[PDB]
Design brief:
- The structure is cut from a larger assembly and holds eight protein chains of eight kinds.
- Chain C is built from two helices and no strands.
- With 56 residues, chain C is mainly alpha-helical.
- In chain C, 5% of the residues are buried.
- Chain D is of the alpha+beta class and 74 residues long.
- Chain D has helices at residues 2-12, 16-19, 59-65, and strands at 29-31, 45-47, 50-51, 53-54.
- Chain F has helices at residues 18-21, 59-71; strands spanning 24-29, 36-38, 44-46, 52-56, 77-82, 88-90.
- In chain F, the strands form two sheets. A four-stranded antiparallel beta sheet of chain F has the order 4-1-5-6. Chain F has a two-stranded antiparallel sheet with strand order 2-3.
- In chain F, a hairpin with a 5-residue loop joins strand 5 (77-82) and strand 6.
- The A-B interface holds A 688-691, 694-697, 699 and B 44, 47-55, 57-58, 62-63, 65.
- The complex binds chlorophyll A (8 copies), beta,beta-caroten-4-one (ECH), beta-carotene and phylloquinone.
- One chlorophyll A (CLA) is lined by residues 23-28, 336, 383-384, 386-387, 390, 394, 560-561, 578, 581, 716, 720, 724 of chain A.
- Chain C: It is found in: Cellular thylakoid membrane.
């Protein structure tokens, strides 16, 4: 039937299994029939270009609709009180009441309010007109076309890169760090200085006049001279109104270090100063390696080193890394598993900052965008983190060569993996028995009308971190809260210019910068501890046990994703390392759930000016049940009541939608195949023995979904329901109250 | 037979059933459904359909549906007759008051 | 083709049979006189088509 | 033992004798939890000067259908 | 209040250029 | 191929369209008595005193039946594979000796002289077109 | 389709052949001095893959494995 | 140019599914 074109085994399949499994392994080039290592890398390289194009085309969409169907110019004049528009609705199913409800934000038709926060990005970036967005949209289309042509080009025969070009790792670090990180960071300081910072001060700078008008009054002569202090002479005053010249200054680079008073965001002058310094280090960082000129460090030589100054050490930190370089470079799953974890951490790193240190103007007061953006990135951090171990497990199956490693660090981990998996189980058990029973003790004892008997304990040493940053509320008078301490007033160089601005922000109380933590904040971090240790326990186990176990020593021969080894020797329901991945997402989704509930309820108390309800009721779990879930769901469920319809009608429909998607998955998890195959065999009998429908007959024989497939179909249902129904609650609860 | 059958649900129960253009919506909606029904035949015909089965009630081989030609000719006639049945049902129901008014 | 023959034959007869029912049938002097001819003419076509398939 | 246990609680720890005086204002109770940690709350003012947990099995209505009017009979 | 009509058709015509190239890259990857 | 059908009224559980199109199977056995035996797909059926023959949709139905026949002390059961063109092939007791008992004429197939621990790793064998179980 | 591979730890218990629903395995004479019987898998095309052979093997780990692979009508247990 | 929504929306809901599922169903069933 020749549909797959990568596996003859699937094509020689009379059943419906071929259609599903074809969808599964179509991106799995390593499993494709007759795929050499050269063609593998070459096909992967071209695919990246098509992926990058999808990103820029998606970015072009945000600018086109906001320009064509949006209120950007209107929102700029009153950002706090005007609601941004994402795009326009056109649904023939709507009735007159629905259109009258969704006609909002001053639009002339049914329209969708925005919650991505691009309006606050595009205001801070230097854009002030719909036409400027249109140019960016058209530019990205051509910018995407540039990559799509490159992908086609690099598959042509004489332009196809060679295998050695891909494995030239020491060069790639040299260019990415210096060029992709550095120059892109250096360039961004240019736009901030030439476009954004002037536009914040009132002057209109564009392609027409950026060559003529200068950012600073003095030219570039102080830089080439070296008297760099000139650029930080006149900073923007505190009473500076954004996008105007009142209270403005001439400084392009400075280290004021605090928050802008009006926008309650970071100073753009610092962001320009910021990226410039980082680009210098990244460029400096780039020149480390051994690329063809000969001047630099060889990572392979550093890894295989066995000698310090005089002592014959086993390696770096006298640890044997004798075969880590070839391991990293030769196997792609090792790289992908590594790069995903690095990116997964950075994704959470973004989220942890953007609410505490908002960079974009007036985004802090848009309470809905601040919540959706946090919940967005953290969910993404999970998959990037959870996907990392999945590829680390795939590496140990189909790419790990024990003969090449032979006593390095990596083999040393597999030797004592029992201690790694065992001690993780103790930590996960040690946390949950104690974390839970404190919630249950407080919940019961509060239910018995004696809240004073609760086990409330203060996050002491965490407050020492906030007191270490200059928070006076706790009164510890530690580093940077004591004015006499050496860190507050640096003895050699009294150059802590960040101090007057930082202390004003952290000690304000209005912003979300290092908010107050109480006993309720304590227990939840240990719940978060339990999630992250246990997710690791599952994933670490499957990876290390992917190659073998006492139950199934020959697991590597079968592969990463196999269903089972049958019922023999006690039962082998879930042995594959794919199953460890499979059980982990059920946790990892819950971990951010525990986080996002903690982020949301803590902030709703602050935005509404009611901090006591969280600090008091967060201890007992009925508080999370009553004060957060029950109370905040009132406006959502009333989105479409029998007394009319309001703006929050999609969310209620989406709320019940994700509930249904969450549940239909459970069928594929609970109910397994053998029941369904027998059921389908009866339908085959009837269709073959019914009078008139006997004319029509399947070409591919219908069969029940495979065991691994139903696990795939079931978890997506678990996840899609999990994601959607909380987004509706997160947005509707926040939007209806507006904090 | 099917165009005459499919006109009813769209008209008396679809949107605009309580309007002046109710019966017209049934005719257009039915034709759009007949076209999809016609398209389905062409795909099942142009995909090398295996065979037609013979059961007890139809003991002999049923018909010459054993090839692409038999199903393709079936599809062309479905659109012709299918649209005809709906157009018939429209003129009767729209002018049923007149036919009784005679 | 056999289908093309009957269409040419039927289009003639359908166009012919409208006349007697309209002008000379009942309700010939009324607003709906021409409408009665359309129904009666189609009636014979159904009966005529029945005899054709029946004879077939 | 179960069935005999239910009617026994109705005999010793209950308000059935008082419930017959006013079945519309006194709620039925036959369970009493001891004054130990925080759980005396469950013995609220169920009615009839008795502090106990309110019952929903309906044994009180059955005994009235059986014509039982005093505790010693139960 | 919104982009002019003529600018919309221009961006729409421009979108064909990624489309023809996306089709070319995609069919080439199949081969 | 010869024999008598077991006497039963019929059953939906049985032969389907696959038999006409591809590879129907058959099973033959001979019994001295005429007992009642459960069929492979539901129901019960009697068996004649000589040369019983039954058509089955798969090979698993026959050996499952043959195991039931061994309860009645019947050990001469032969399974065939009837193709749509009428080609029949004698399969299950491929030699006169049953599979569980040894016969000299047979040869070992898909035998690995090594133990499972001695098999190579997958990384040692990738892009070659060979598997670890070889 | 599903490959059935036998290893040298066989001891001629014959418990694998008796468990086969489809008669895939057949004992054969071991020419060496181990025993007069060692298993084989001639009719591997009919391997449905129910792993009954593995549950019946008395070794520490198996003398006979069943590595799943491509599917067919005979392997998927389809009577239609 | 709000009329474009009346032409481009149903193309995504009706024309694109019909054309894609039509070709794919024939492609997967080819021999
Ligand atoms: C019968 C129920 C129903 C139906 C059929 C629709 C239909 C629609 N609504 Mg809608 N809506 C409904 C109820 C319904 N609504 C209700 C109850 C509400 C609440 C009052 C709304 C509120 C609402 C809003 C607010 C909006 C819509 C919009 C839309 C349109 C989206 C069209 C589009 O972009 O392409 C289809 C959309 C897709 C996302 C594609 C499918 C996505 C799948 C999951 C992934 C795609 C890959 C796929 C799996 C692979 C196979 C496909 C192959 C071709 C590759 C569409 C006409 C939007 C609109 O006006 O159109 C722009 C819009 O903004 N609706
Ligand atoms: C970002 C980099 C990246 C890359 C390059 C890959 C690449 C790969 N992964 Mg991987 N992965 C990643 C991230 C990545 N993944 C992440 C972040 C995770 C964690 C979730 C995983 C988890 C993962 C697992 C568990 C496995 C892979 C596998 C694979 C390989 C096969 C892919 C496949 O089967 O086709 C893709 C097939 C699909 C069916 C993908 C689409 C399915 C989505 C989930 C459908 C969602 C439904 C719908 C669209 C939503 C509707 C919305 C509703 C409201 C209407 C391939 C090499 C597999 C393998 O065997 O590796 C060799 C394998 O077992 N990966
Ligand atoms: C015993 C049953 C029976 C019945 C119920 C009728 C009924 C009728 N005959 Mg009739 N007829 C019968 C037996 C019967 N006939 C027999 C046995 C003979 C032979 C002698 C005749 C000879 C005869 C003649 C010669 C005429 C009639 C006419 C009529 C109609 C005149 C009504 C009127 O007042 O003016 C008219 C009132 C109207 C409301 C207009 C009527 C419009 C027609 C009947 C609509 C028919 C549509 C039809 C069902 C389409 C068929 C297709 C369908 C099978 C799928 C009436 C419907 C007269 C006529 O012209 O009818 C059109 C006429 O000229 N009949
Ligand atoms: C995403 C794209 C999309 C779009 C644009 C539409 C659009 C429409 N849907 Mg729809 N639908 C969709 C997806 C979509 N649907 C999906 C995915 C589902 C599955 C849940 C549905 C389920 C659905 C139902 C169940 C119903 C609709 C109906 C309708 C129509 C209501 C219009 C109105 O106000 O009342 C009607 C106003 C009128 C003026 C009469 C409409 C006349 C029709 C639309 C004419 C169509 C002509 C046809 C295409 C002719 C083709 C012939 C040619 C090929 C030769 C409208 C045309 C309703 C309907 O009855 O439409 C007929 C209806 O009952 N839809
Ligand atoms: C200066 C030279 C240079 C440059 C600019 C690049 C650039 C790139 N190469 Mg490349 N390459 C080079 C030299 C270079 N390479 C050399 C010499 C070799 C041979 C040794 C290669 C071999 C090579 C391969 C084999 C591949 C690439 C790939 C890529 C792309 C990576 C994906 C991407 O866009 O990441 C973008 C990344 C960034 C912009 C920065 C890092 C990400 C951080 C997290 C963002 C910054 C933080 C900030 C807060 C984000 C804010 C966002 C804002 C919107 C708010 C990228 C376009 C890959 C690709 O995509 O294929 C086309 C690929 O497969 N290159
Ligand atoms: C609310 C539901 C829930 C709960 C409570 C747990 C709890 C647990 N899971 Mg888990 N799990 C769940 C849902 C849940 N899971 C779901 C939906 C999935 C997806 C399939 C998984 C997948 C999963 C995997 C894959 C793994 C776990 C693991 C664990 C354990 C981790 C150790 C720990 O945190 O110690 C805290 C433990 C508790 C809080 C439970 C202790 C029980 C109570 C508090 C005390 C018992 C006294 C009792 C009340 C009195 C007896 C009364 C009498 C009638 C008998 C723990 C037992 C991991 C594990 O076991 O490794 C150690 C592991 O590997 N689970
Ligand atoms: C994380 C699990 C956990 C932990 C750490 C505790 C810890 C505690 N509970 Mg608690 N409790 C738990 C679970 C837990 N409980 C559960 C699951 C429930 C019910 C669902 C309760 C219900 C509960 C009540 C109702 C009360 C406590 C009380 C107490 C405190 C005093 C216990 C006592 O008298 O020591 C024992 C006494 C000694 C003198 C030590 C002697 C040691 C040995 C036996 C001598 C030989 C102590 C802080 C009491 C409290 O805090 O009151 C203020 C109290 O009244 N608990
Ligand atoms: C499954 C239950 C169900 C039922 C019964 C209905 C019923 C209806 N829907 Mg609806 N709908 C449903 C689920 C259902 N919906 C779901 C799940 C959604 C969410 C996507 C919607 C979304 C929706 C929208 C958005 C709209 C409707 C509309 C309608 C109405 C018009 C139906 C129409 O035009 O179809 C035409 C139907 C056909 C052409 C096929 C009819 C099949 C017949 C009845 C088969 C009979 C078989 C026969 C008895 C057996 C033969 C035996 C033989 C031997 C003789 C009607 C009241 C429209 C409306 O305005 O409502 C008033 C409309 O616009 N629906
Ligand atoms: C040469 C050269 C020099 C001359 C330099 C001069 C004279 C000009 C330099 C021009 C350059 C190099 C400009 C950079 C152009 C790239 C731009 C302007 C755009 C990047 C946009 C991106 C990537 C996408 C942005 C997006 C879009 C489009 C949006 O609409 C919203 C934001 C976001 C989504 C991010 C000097 C004398 C120094 C030294 C000698 C050599
Ligand atoms: C009693 C009974 C029954 C019932 C029946 C029924 C219910 C029926 C159906 C009905 C139907 C379902 C009907 C339908 C019909 C239809 C028709 C009547 C058609 C028409 C057509 C036409 C006339 C057309 C024509 C045309 C064409 C084709 C083309 C062009 C145009 C025109 C229009 C000319 C049954 C069998 C079930 C069972 C047994 C008993
Ligand atoms: C219902 C069910 C079935 C039977 C399910 C079948 C046959 C699937 C039928 C679904 C049809 C194909 C419609 C699905 C359409 C989807 C909405 C879209 C899928 C198309 C994507 C490729 C876009 C199993 O085979 C099974 C196996 C193992 C554990 C649990 C189960 C199980 O629960």
């Amino acid at each position: 039937t020749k549909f797959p074109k990568f596996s003859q085994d699937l094509a020689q399949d009379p059943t419906t299994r071929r259609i599903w499994y074809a969808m599964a392994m179509g991106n799995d080039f390593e499993s494709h029939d007759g795929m050499t290592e050269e063609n593998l890398y070459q096909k992967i390289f071209a695919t990246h270009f098509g992926h990058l194009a999808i990103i820029f085309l998606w970015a072009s969409s945000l600018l086109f609709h906001v320009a064509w169907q949006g209120n950007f110019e209107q929102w700029i004049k009153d950002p706090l009180h005007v609601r941004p528009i994402a795009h326009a609705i056109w649904d023939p199913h709507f009735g007159k009441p629905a259109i009258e409800a969704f006609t909002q934000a001053g639009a002339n038709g049914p329209v969708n309010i925005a919650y991505s926060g691009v309006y606050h990005w595009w205001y801070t970036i230097g854009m002030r007109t719909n036409t400027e967005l249109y140019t960016g949209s058209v530019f990205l289309l051509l910018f995407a076309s540039l990559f799509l042509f490159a992908g086609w080009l690099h598959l042509q025969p004489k332009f196809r890169p060679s295998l050695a070009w891909f494995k030239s790792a020491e060069s790639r670090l040299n260019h990415h760090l210096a060029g992709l990180f550095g120059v892109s960071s250096l360039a961004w300081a240019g736009h901030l200085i030439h476009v954004a910072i002037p536009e914040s001060r009132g002057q209109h700078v564009g392609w027409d006049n950026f060559l003529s008008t200068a950012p600073h009054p003095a030219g570039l002569q102080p830089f080439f001279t070296g008297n760099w202090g000139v650029y930080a002479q006149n900073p923007d005053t505190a009473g500076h109104i954004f996008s105007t010249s009142q209270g403005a200054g001439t400084a392009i680079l400075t280290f004021l270090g605090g928050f802008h008073p009006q926008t309650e965001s970071l100073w753009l002058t610092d962001m320009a100063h910021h990226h410039l310094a980082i680009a210098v280090l990244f460029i400096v960082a780039g020149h480390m390696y051994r690329t063809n000129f000969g001047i630099g460090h060889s990572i392979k030589e550093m890894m295989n080193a066995k000698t310090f100054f005089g002592k014959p050490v086993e390696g770096p930190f006298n640890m044997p890394h004798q075969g880590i370089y070839d391991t990293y470079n030769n196997s792609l799953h090792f790289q992908l598993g590594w790069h995903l974890a690095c990116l997964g951490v950075v994704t959470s790193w973004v989220a942890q900052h953007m609410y505490s240190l908002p960079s974009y103007a007036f985004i802090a007061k848009d309470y809905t965008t601040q919540a959706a953006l946090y919940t967005h990135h953290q969910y993404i951090a999970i998959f990037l983190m959870v996907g990392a171990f999945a590829h680390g497990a795939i590496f140990l199956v189909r790419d790990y060569d024990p003969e090449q490693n032979k006593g390095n660090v990596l083999e040393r981990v597999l030797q004592h993996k029992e201690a790694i998996i065992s001690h993780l189980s103790w930590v996960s058990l040690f946390l949950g028995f104690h974390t839970l029973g404190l919630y249950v003790h407080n919940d019961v004892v509060v239910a018995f009308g004696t809240p004073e008997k609760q086990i409330l304990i203060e996050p002491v040493f965490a407050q020492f971190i906030q007191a270490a940053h200059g928070k006076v509320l706790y009164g510890l008078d530690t580093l940077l809260s004591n004015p006499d301490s050496v860190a507050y007033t640096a003895y050699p160089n009294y150059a802590n210019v960040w101090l007057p601005g930082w202390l004003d922000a952290i000690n304000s109380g209005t912003n979300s910068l290092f908010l107050t933590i109480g006993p309720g904040d304590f227990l939840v971090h240990h719940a978060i501890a339990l999630g992250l240790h246990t997710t690791t326990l599952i994933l670490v186990k499957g990876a290390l046990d992917a190659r073998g176990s006492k139950l199934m020593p020959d697991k590597k021969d079968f592969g990463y994703a196999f269903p089972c080894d049958g019922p023999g020797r006690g039962g082998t329901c879930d042995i594959s390392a794919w199953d460890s991945f499979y059980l982990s997402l059920f946790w990892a989704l819950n971990t951010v759930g525990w986080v996002t509930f903690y982020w949301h309820w803590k902030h709703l108390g602050i935005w509404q000016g009611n901090v006591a309800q969280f600090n008091e009721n967060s201890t007992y779990l009925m508080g999370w049940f009553r004060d957060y879930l029950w109370a905040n769901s009132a406006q959502l469920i009333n989105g479409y009541n029998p007394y009319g319809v309001n703006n929050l009608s999609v969310w209620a429909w989406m709320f019940l939608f994700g509930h249904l998607v969450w549940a239909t998955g459970f069928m594929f998890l609970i109910s397994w195949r053998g029941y369904w195959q027998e059921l389908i065999e009866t339908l085959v009998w009837a269709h073959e023995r019914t009078p008139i429908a006997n004319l029509v007959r399947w070409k591919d024989k219908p069969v029940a979904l495979s065991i691994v497939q139903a696990r795939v179909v079931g978890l997506a249902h678990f996840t899609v329901g999990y994601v959607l129904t909380y987004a509706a609650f997160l947005i509707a609860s926040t939007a209806g109250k507006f904090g | 037979a099917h165009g005459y059958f499919l006109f009813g649900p769209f008209a008396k129960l679809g949107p605009l059933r309580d309007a002046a253009n109710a019966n017209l919506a049934g005719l257009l909606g039915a034709i759009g459904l007949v076209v999809l029904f016609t398209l389905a035949l062409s795909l099942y015909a142009n995909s090398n359909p295996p065979t037609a089965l013979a059961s007890v009630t139809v003991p002999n081989p049923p018909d010459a549906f054993q090839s692409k030609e038999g199903w393709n000719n079936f599809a062309s006639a479905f659109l012709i007759g299918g649209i005809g049945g709906a157009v018939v049902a429209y003129f009767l129901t729209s002018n049923l008051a007149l036919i009784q008014g005679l | 083709t056999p289908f093309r023959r009957g269409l040419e034959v039927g289009m003639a007869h359908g166009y012919f049979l409208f006349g007697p029912f309209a002008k000379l049938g009942p309700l010939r002097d009324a607003a709906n006189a021409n409408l009665a001819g359309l129904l009666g003419a189609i009636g014979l076509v159904v009966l005529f088509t029945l005899a054709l398939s029946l004879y077939a | 033992i179960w069935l005999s246990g239910m009617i026994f609680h109705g005999a010793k720890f209950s308000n059935y004798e008082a419930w017959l005086s006013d079945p519309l204002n006194v709620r039925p109770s036959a369970q009493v939890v001891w004054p130990i940690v925080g759980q005396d709350i469950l013995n609220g003012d169920v009615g009839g000067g008795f502090h106990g947990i309110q019952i929903t099995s309906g044994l009180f209505q059955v005994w009235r259908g059986w014509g039982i009017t005093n505790s010693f009979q139960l | 209040s919104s982009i002019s009509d003529t600018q919309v058709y221009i961006a729409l015509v421009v979108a064909l250029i990624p489309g023809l190239l996306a089709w070319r890259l995609a069919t080439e990857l199949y081969k | 191929l010869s024999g008598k059908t077991p006497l039963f009224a019929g059953s939906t559980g049985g032969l389907l369209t696959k038999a006409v199109e591809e590879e129907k199977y058959a099973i033959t056995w001979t019994s001295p008595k005429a007992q009642v035996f459960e069929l492979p797909t539901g129901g019960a059926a009697t068996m004649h005193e000589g040369e019983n023959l039954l058509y089955i949709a798969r090979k698993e139905y026959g050996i499952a039946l043959g195991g039931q026949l061994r309860k009645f002390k019947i050990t001469n059961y032969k399974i065939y594979r009837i193709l749509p063109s009428g080609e029949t092939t004698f399969i299950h007791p491929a030699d006169g000796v049953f599979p569980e008992k040894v016969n000299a004429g047979r040869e070992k197939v898909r035998f690995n002289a090594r133990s499972i621990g001695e098999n190579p790793n997958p990384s040692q064998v990738k892009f070659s077109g060979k598997a670890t179980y070889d | 389709s599903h490959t059935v591979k036998i290893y040298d730890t066989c001891i001629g218990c014959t418990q694998c052949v008796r468990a086969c629903p489809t008669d895939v395995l057949e004992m054969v004479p071991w020419d060496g001095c181990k025993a007069a019987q060692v298993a084989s898998s001639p009719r591997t095309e009919d391997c449905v893959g129910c792993k009954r052979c593995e549950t019946a093997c008395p070794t520490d780990f198996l003398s006979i494995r069943v590595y799943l692979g491509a599917e067919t009508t005979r392997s998927m247990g389809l009577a239609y | 140019a709000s009329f474009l929504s009346s032409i481009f929306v149903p193309v995504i809901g009706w024309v694109v599914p019909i054309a894609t599922f039509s070709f794919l169903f024939l492609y997967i069933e080819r021999e």
